[PDB]
Amino acid sequence: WXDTGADXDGXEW
Ligand SMILES: *C(=O)CCCCCCCCC
């Protein structure tokens, strides 16, 4: 889960 980002609005999740 969340290979992008790991944040609701940060690094396109
Ligand atoms: C997020 O949806 C998945 C995070 C876990 C990925 C594990 C990959 C390796 C399995 C052997």
After which residues is the backbone of the chain broken at C–N > 2.5 Å? none
d(CA 4, ligand 1 centre) in Å:
13
Torsion angle of alpha carbons 11, 3, 6, 10, nearest 10°? Answer: 10
Q: Which residue has the tokens 């609005």?
A: 9
Experimental method: NMR
**Tokens representing residue 7 in the block:** 């944040």
d(CA 12, ligand 1 centre) in Å:
18
d(CA 8, ligand 1 centre) in Å:
19
d(CA 11, ligand 1 centre) in Å:
19
Specify whether the CB–CB gap between 4 and 10 falls below 8 A: no
Q: Determine the Cα angle at 2 with ends 4 and 5, to 5°.
A: 40
Q: How far apart are CA 7 and CA 9, in angstroms?
A: 6
Identity of residue 11: X
Three-state DSSP at 10 gives coil
d(CA 1, ligand 1 centre) in Å:
7
Q: Please, which residues have CB within 8 angstroms of residue 11's CB and are 6 or more apart in sequence?
A: 4, 5
